[PDB]
Amino acid sequence: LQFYRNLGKSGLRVSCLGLGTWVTFGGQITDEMAEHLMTLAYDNGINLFDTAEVYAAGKAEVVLGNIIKKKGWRRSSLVITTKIFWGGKAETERGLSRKHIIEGLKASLERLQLEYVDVVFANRPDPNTPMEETVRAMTHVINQGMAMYWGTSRWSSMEIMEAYSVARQFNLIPPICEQAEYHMFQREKVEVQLPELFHKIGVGAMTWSPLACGIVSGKYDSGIPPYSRASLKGYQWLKDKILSEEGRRQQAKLKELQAIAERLGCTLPQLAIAWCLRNEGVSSVLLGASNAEQLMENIGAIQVLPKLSSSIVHEIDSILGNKPY
Amino acid sequence: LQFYRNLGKSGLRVSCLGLGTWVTFGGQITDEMAEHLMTLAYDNGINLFDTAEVYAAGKAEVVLGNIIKKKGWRRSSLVITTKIFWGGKAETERGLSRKHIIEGLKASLERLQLEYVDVVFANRPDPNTPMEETVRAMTHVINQGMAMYWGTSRWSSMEIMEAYSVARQFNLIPPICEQAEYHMFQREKVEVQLPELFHKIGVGAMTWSPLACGIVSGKYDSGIPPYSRASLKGYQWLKDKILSEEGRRQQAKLKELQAIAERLGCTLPQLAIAWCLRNEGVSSVLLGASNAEQLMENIGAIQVLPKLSSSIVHEIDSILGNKPY
Amino acid sequence: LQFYRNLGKSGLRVSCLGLGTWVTFGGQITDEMAEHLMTLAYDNGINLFDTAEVYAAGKAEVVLGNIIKKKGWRRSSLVITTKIFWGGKAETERGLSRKHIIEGLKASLERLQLEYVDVVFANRPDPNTPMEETVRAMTHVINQGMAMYWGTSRWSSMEIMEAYSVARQFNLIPPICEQAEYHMFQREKVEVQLPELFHKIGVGAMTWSPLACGIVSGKYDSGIPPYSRASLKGYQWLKDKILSEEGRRQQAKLKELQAIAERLGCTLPQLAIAWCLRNEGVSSVLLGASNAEQLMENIGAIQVLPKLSSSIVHEIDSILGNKPY
Amino acid sequence: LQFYRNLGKSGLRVSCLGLGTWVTFGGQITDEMAEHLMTLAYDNGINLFDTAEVYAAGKAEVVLGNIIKKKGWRRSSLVITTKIFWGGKAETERGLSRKHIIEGLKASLERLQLEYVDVVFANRPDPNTPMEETVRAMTHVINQGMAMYWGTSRWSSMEIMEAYSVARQFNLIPPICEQAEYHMFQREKVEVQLPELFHKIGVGAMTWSPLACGIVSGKYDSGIPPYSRASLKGYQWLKDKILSEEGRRQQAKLKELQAIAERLGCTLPQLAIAWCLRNEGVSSVLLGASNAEQLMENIGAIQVLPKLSSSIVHEIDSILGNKPY
Numbered sequence A, B, C, D: 001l002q003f004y005r006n007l008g009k010s011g012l013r014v015s016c017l018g019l020g021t022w023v024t025f026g027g028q029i030t031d032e033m034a035e036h037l038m039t040l041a042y043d044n045g046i047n048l049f050d051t052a053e054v055y056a057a058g059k060a061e062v063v064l065g066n067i068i069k070k071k072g073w074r075r076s077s078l079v080i081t082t083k084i085f086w087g088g089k090a091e092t093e094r095g096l097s098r099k100h101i102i103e104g105l106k107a108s109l110e111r112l113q114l115e116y117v118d119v120v121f122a123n124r125p126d127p128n129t130p131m132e133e134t135v136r137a138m139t140h141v142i143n144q145g146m147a148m149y150w151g152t153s154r155w156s157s158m159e160i161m162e163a164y165s166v167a168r169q170f171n172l173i174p175p176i177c178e179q180a181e182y183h184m185f186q187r188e189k190v191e192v193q194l195p196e197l198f199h200k201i202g203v204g205a206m207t208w209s210p211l212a213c214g215i216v217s218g219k220y221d222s223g224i225p226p227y228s229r230a231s232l233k234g235y236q237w238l239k240d241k242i243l244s245e246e247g248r249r250q251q252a253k254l255k256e257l258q259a260i261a262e263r264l265g266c267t268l269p270q271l272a273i274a275w276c277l278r279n280e281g282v283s284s285v286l287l288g289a290s291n292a293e294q295l296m297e298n299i300g301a302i303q304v305l306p307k308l309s310s311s312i313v314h315e316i317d318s319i320l321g322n323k324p325y
Ligand SMILES: NC(=O)C1=CN([C@@H]2O[C@H](COP(=O)(O)OP(=O)(O)OC[C@H]3O[C@@H](n4cnc5c(N)ncnc54)[C@H](OP(=O)(O)O)[C@@H]3O)[C@@H](O)[C@H]2O)C=CC1
Pocket: A019, A020, A021, A022, A023, A028, A050, A051, A083, A123, A153, A154, A179, A207, A208, A209, A210, A211, A212, A213, A214, A215, A217, A219, A223, A224, A225, A226, A227, A228, A229, A230, A269, A286, A287, A288, A289, A290, A293, A294, A295, A297, A298
C-alpha cells in the first residue's frame, strides 16, 4: 500500500482517502463537528477535501473555508477540490458555459476564502454547452490561477475523450480526473471503463460514496454506531432505495459480507472501504462522515487492506455476484 | 416555445426577449422610467440587456449601470451586452482597432460599473482595420476577463466567416453572434443568410427593431398607447422614412395585418414581435420601450406565439409579399 | 493628401506628422517650451508623440508624461510611442532580452505615468538576443496591456522578416512598423526596402530626422529662425559631419534647393518635410522642434504638399543626384 | 576573456562569476557577513546570485532579500535565481507538479521580497510528474511575471531534451539553462554532454561547487585561509568523502596541482576556479564563500585566466588523469 499516490498521471499527490463535505458541512452536522472531523482527517495524513457550490447552497464551502483559516494549515499542504454546475435559480446560474464556470468558481472561491482550488470539477455533463467552450473555460480559470487542474464527474468515457480531443486540437488543458461513484454495488464504470482512460489519456479516478450513502455499513439492519441520513430532510429517495425490493436484496448480501468482516477482524464499513482501495486504478476514495467515530472507523480501513487476499476478493464477488464484464 | 435558449451554439442562455437601451436610457425617458422598465423586464424573466458606448454618449451605459447597482441583482443572473465602434470625436476613438476595442470596452465598463460584459459586439464593420487585429483584440479582452464572448453587428456573412477563418487559423476565439435588424419589412438577412452561418459555424442571431422603430405598431395611423420617436431630436430620417412614398405603402399593409391581430386577439405590436420569435433561428429579440405599458404589451407577444399557425404566417407573407428567396 | 493614415497595414491611425522628444524634452528646451510645443501639435491635429527610455536619461519621458496629465487630453486621443534598448549602466539594463523589455517598458511607463504606450519599439537590433525571445517578450507586454503594438528601428529588412517568421511560427504578434531615418540625404532604405516589407508583411514606415538634425533647414548657411544643436553638449559628431568635406557638398546642394523653395513659396524646411510625405509609403514623419516658430513652420509643410509636382520632384533628384536604385 | 556573457543562447547577460547562498546565508555565516559578501560581489561586477527554497529552510532567501532591499540596488541590475523542489514536509510540498511550482516559487518570492526571479530552476528531476505538466507550469509562472526564464538542474541530457520537445510540441517555453556540478574532479557532464545541448537547443551551463565544497582549496592538507564545512552540522557525508580512500587519492593530486599554482603565481582555489572558466561552454561559475577573504581570493581567479595555456591545461589533465571521453 501507498498512502499517497498520484491523481491519475498528474503530478498532484493525494492521500488514498479524502474527506468530502456533501450533506454534512453547513447542513447535517454542526460547524464544531466539522472542524473536529477535518482536524482528525488532516492530522491523520488526509490532504484531500472535496466540496461543491451546490452543497448546502454554498454553506459547505463557507464552513470548509472557515475551518481552514481558523486552523491555519499551510495552503500548500492541502488539496482542495470543488464541483461546479448548479449555482443558483437564475437560468444562467447553472451549466458548464464559460459564464457559469467563471462566475461559479469565483463565487465558490469567495465562500471558501481561497485564491484557488487544486482541482475544479464539472459536477456533471452539460448538453447545452459545446465541449470547446467548456474546455477553454476550464483552461482559462487554470491560467488565471483560480485552479491548478480540472476534472469531470458523471461524464461518459466518450465525453471525457471528447474533452481530451478538444484540448489537444486547440492546445488547451486536458482533464486529469473523473469523480465516479464506487462501492460494492456500483462497479462497472470504475472497474472496466476508467482504467481504459487512465492508460489512453492519463485520467485518474477519484471515487465517492464508498458505503452507498451509508447502506453498505449495514446501519439499516447490522450497522455501525452513528446517525441516520435515509431519514433526513429531502432524502426520501434514499429511504425508498433502501426499502425497495432490491434494497432488501443488497441488504441481504451485506449480512453475508458482514461475516467475512468479522472473520477478517474489522467492521463492515472498513471492509467496504478497503475494498475500494484494492484497485490500483482508484487514486483516492472520498469518505463521508457525520461524527468522529465514523471517521476514525473508516480511516481504519487502511489496516484492513493487507488482509484482503485474492480469495477474499473472489469470495466477495460470489456474494455480490456482480463482478463487471 | 422555449423561453430561454442558447445564443447561437454557445453555452450562454438568454431569454427569447431582451430589453435594449437605444434612444431610451439617458435620453428620451427618465432614469426613474428606466429603472422601472428594467425591473419589470427582470422580474418577468428577461436577463438580456443591450447597450452601446455610442448610445446617449455613454449615458445609456451609466443609467443601466446605476439601475444594476441600485437593484442589487446578482451579476450571474444578468446577461449584459454592449457594442463598440463610435466612442469619441478623436480620430483614434472610433473603429475596431485593438486600441479602440481595448479603450472603448474599458470605458463602457467604467460607465457600466462592471468588471465585464457577457458579450461585446462590434457595432459595425471596419474597413480600416485588418480582421486579424480585430479578432485578436476581441480574443484579448475575453482572456482579460473584460468580456465572456464577442459578437458582430451589421457584418456580412462573408465578413463573419472571415472572422471565423482568422480565429481558426491563429487559434483565437470565433464570434458567437450577429445582431441583425429584423421585422416584417426587413427579412432577407435573418431568414436566409443567418441560418447558413448557424449551421456552418454556430453563429446565433440576436435581432433588433422588432417594430421598425415603432413603425410596425401602427402608431402612425392605427397605433398602440405610447409616445412618438419619429418626432424626436435628430430623427428627421425616421420621420422622412415614415412619410416616404414607401412609408405609406408599408403603413397600408399594416392596416391589413392589424386585422389578423384582432382576429388573433392581440395587438399589432404583439403580432409583429411574436412573428420575430416564430424563427427557431432567432435566439432573442431586443425590445424597445419608452414606457411600462409598451413593455408589458410587448412582453405579451409570448402568448401570441402558440396561436401563430403556418396558414397565419403564409397569410402574413401574402400581405407583406416580401418573403425572402 | 490624407492627414490621418494607417501605420502600415495596422488599424492604428496616425497623423502624417508627429512630434518627437529627442534632444528636446528634459534637455535642450524648458518644460514650459515643451508643454507649449505639444499643445500646439495636439491642437493642430497631431496625435503621434515619440520618445525613448534613453532620451535625457528618462527625463524626456517624465516631461512628456507631465504635459499629458497637466493638459488632461483623453488617452484615447493620443498615440504615444517609446523605444527600448539603453536603460541603464548595468549589464542587464540594455538590449532586447525579455528581462530588459519587461523592466525597460515598465520603467518608461512609470516615468510617463501611463498604463501603456500605443507602440513600443526596439530602438535597435540586438546581436546577443535570439529573435524568439524578443518577439515573445514584445508579444508578452502587448498581452499584458503594457503596449498596443510593437515596432522595430534600425533593423534590416531581413531582421524584420525574421521577426515576422518567428511570430508566424510560434503564433506570436508580428511587428507593425519600422522607425527609419529619412531625408533628402538618406533615401535608400525608405524608398527601396521598406515598400517591399509593406506589401509582403504589412510593415509601415515611420520616419525621423526630416531635416537631418537641422542640416536640411540650411541653418548652417541659409537657415530658418531658430537655435543651434550642432553646438550642443555631446553633439561634436553632428558639428563634425556638418564641417566635413561632404558636409560642405550637401550644404552646397541645399543652396540650389533653397531656390526651388522660394520658387514654390515656402521655406526650405517645409520643402524638405513635405518631400518626406510625398511617399504614400511613409505613414508618418516625426518632427523635431526646439521652439514654437520652428514647429509651426514645419507643420506648414502640409500646404507645400499639393504644389509638389513630379517635375519638381525630378528636379530635386537631379540636384541631389542620389535617387535610390 | 569576456566578463559578461550570455546564459546559453538567451538574451540574459550574466557575470562569469556568481555568488551562491547554499550552506551560507541564513546558516553558517551571519547576516552581517552575508551583506558584506554580496556587496563585495556586486561592487566587483557580479550580478548573478543563486539561492533555493530549501536552503536553510527559506532563511537563505530571506537574508538575500533583506540585503537587496537594504542596499537599494536596482532590480534591473541584478540577476536573481532560485531553485524549486523541496519546500516542506507535506506530501504536496515537494516535486515539480504545477501545484508546487506555483506555490513554491510564490513562497520564495515572498521570502525574497521580490515580484520575480530572473531564472527559476527545477532543483532536480521529478519521476512522479509528467514533463508536460512541469513545462506548462514553468511557462505559466513566466507568463505571470513571476520569473523571466527557467532552467533545470541535475537533469540528464535526455530529460532536458524531453522538456524542449514538450515546449515545441505545445508551444511552451523551453529551458534556457542547466545548473551542473563542475570542478577538476567532476567533468564528464559539463565537458561532453552540455556542449551538445548548447549547439542543438541553446541550453547554457551554469556550474556550481568549483572547489568541490572546499576540497579543492586543499584546506584539508594545503588549504587557504578560511573556516571548515566538512565539520559542520549535517555534513558528515562531506567529511566521509574527504576521509574516504579516494578522498585521499584526490587530496594527493591537489598537492601536485598546488605546485602548478605557485608556478603560476596564484592560489590553488584561484587555479581551480579559473580552470572552470577556461570553457567557453560555461556561462558562469557559482562561487561559495563564508568570508570576505575567500570571496576576494576567488574573484581573483579572473586574473589567473590568461596565464592558463593549453600546455598548462594538458599538464592538469595528466595530474588528474580523468579528462572526459
Ligand atoms: N462528484 C459527485 O457527483 C459526488 C461526489 N461525492 C463526494 O463523496 C462524498 C460523499 O460520500 P457520501 O456519498 O456522503 O457517503 P458514503 O458512502 O461514504 O457514506 C457516508 C455516510 O455513511 C454513514 N457512515 C459513514 N461511516 C460510517 C460508519 N463507520 N459506520 C456507520 N455509518 C457510517 C453516515 O451516515 P449518517 O449521516 O446517516 O450518519 C455518512 O454520512 C462527498 O463528501 C463528496 O465530496 C458525493 C456524491 C456525489
